[PDB]
Amino acid sequence: GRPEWIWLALGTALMGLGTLYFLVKGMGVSDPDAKKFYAITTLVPAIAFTMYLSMLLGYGLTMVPFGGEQNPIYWARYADWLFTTPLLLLDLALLVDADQGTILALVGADGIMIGTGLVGALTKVYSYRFVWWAISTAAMLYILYVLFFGKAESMRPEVASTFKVLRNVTVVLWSAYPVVWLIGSEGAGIVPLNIETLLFMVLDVSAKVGFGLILLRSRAIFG
């Protein structure tokens, strides 16, 4: 039906397999700290799996009028990210034993990032969609700022090493989302929805399963 269906189907399959792999791999783990990381990390692709399935079956898709056309908007992505992005930030924060204040700042700014992105995606006045994109981007920039300038002296080498790798992976991949949104169907519409869907699938799988494989294979998750 929809040309982007193949990418949604592949996304569903990859998130599903990733979830199952992490689920199996986490069996037997008794270390409290490691359990936290496995729980957070397995839940991420499990949620993504449900939302990709939602998009594939057509439930997480809605039509938004703007620019004089009926624009297909997959709102299920925000329902996904609303829960998965904060969880991913939690993995990074727990890894460096961040204090509660910083965790709340990250989670709250993340909520603002996704919430304003959702508002922008459903906004009927074309020009306003970009106002929301700008605010969401400012929130993302705040998050990236905190990750880099927001624990070193008393920090295990493996912890510092894995955190630096996951932080770099996060900054690169997350930074692409606003660009894809801006040039894709939710924004300027210069890149067709099918290609946009492919881009998000690669980014999502990398930021979730890729990110997860790196974290769960590290000894940093253990006390």
Next chain:
Amino acid sequence: GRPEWIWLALGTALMGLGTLYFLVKGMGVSDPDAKKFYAITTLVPAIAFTMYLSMLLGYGLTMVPFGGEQNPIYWARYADWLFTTPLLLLDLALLVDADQGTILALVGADGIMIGTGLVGALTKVYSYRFVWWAISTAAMLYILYVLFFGKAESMRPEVASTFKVLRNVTVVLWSAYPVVWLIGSEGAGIVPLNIETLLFMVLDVSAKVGFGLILLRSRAIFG
């Protein structure tokens, strides 16, 4: 108007009385641990009370097209369960001093269970509704698994005793929900909505007020 109104009214009344009873019973409690259990346990029927009232007044009801008919779907149940089921799991987890990793696993899987159940309840393609039911059921099975195989050596007798009772009550009652959903109006439609509503009221009151009476009368909630 709607034949199932009597069960919604009785459900509203029972949840309301249960809330008031727990509220009174919890007065004077100074023990920190006991306070946690009273807060969690009183909030559960208070939320259920609001959603049952929502259904009674008709606000938590919507019409979903599928199978060639306008099907009355009480979505308010998921708004209820989304918050009450995780809270109930929290009572069980705190009772056994479960570690954060396991708590997150339970809460996250519970969210998936209710979220996919909601998607299934509102899905317009009949066959797909059952795909969502299957995923939600898999999440429930994971939860039941964790409760039984997911703390013994260093565990007070009263704690182990009450937990085992509440765990058995939980497995039996919770396991009935997917069956009721499957044979009821949201699924195969072989059992009429009025009878389905009665079933859920008995299950809800038992899983909330019944469950609550057992827990709050035990000495396990005290340090």
Next chain:
Amino acid sequence: GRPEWIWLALGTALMGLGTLYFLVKGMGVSDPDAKKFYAITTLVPAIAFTMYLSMLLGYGLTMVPFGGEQNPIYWARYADWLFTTPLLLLDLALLVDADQGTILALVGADGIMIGTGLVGALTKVYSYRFVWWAISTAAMLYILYVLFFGKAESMRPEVASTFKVLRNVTVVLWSAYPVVWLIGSEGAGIVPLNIETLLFMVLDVSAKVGFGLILLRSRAIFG
């Protein structure tokens, strides 16, 4: 377009400036406890900023049929309060080192207060709107009760002093909301929407930025 636009624009500007001020003021803070208070306190007007902008642009506004008319209902307020009121209660609770049980009681009752207020705001049967208002008010009264009768012996003077001031500010300002709602467009409609919007803007800015200035200038936030 809408006469109340000026108050929404001023609200947007004030919440935005307040957010920026708190953001700057919180720079350099290394004290863990102080960080918690700055995070919570800065997030509050940041969220309010987004919802006021939502109302200004028209996204957070919907039409609800009741009383034989199309009533303009700004639902964005509840999306705001759902997150900001619990955060404000968290500031007060952390300030007095409240135990988890009491925190959950406050947060849960707050959720009920806002959730039932939202249901009332969107209810099509006029008389029922007031039933929801009554339940929401009962939840607010419970919260006010807990704040006054729910830690003294072992409590720093500055902490007790600032808490008492913020508690008084909270009881006075919060108590006004149900009155405004009752006499405003969501209720009896005796006070026009434009005036109602002005009232909420003054209350919101005072309960958020005013409240925030008092808290963040106190030494109580430091360990």
